[PDB]
């Protein structure tokens, strides 16, 4: 659950 969280922050980074 949480980490899904952190994993959209990179695939923030990934997404402009």
């Given at each position: 659950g949480i980490?899904?969280?952190l994993?959209?922050?990179l695939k923030k980074?990934?997404?402009k």
């Open positions: 980490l899904s969280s994993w959209k922050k980074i990934i997404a």
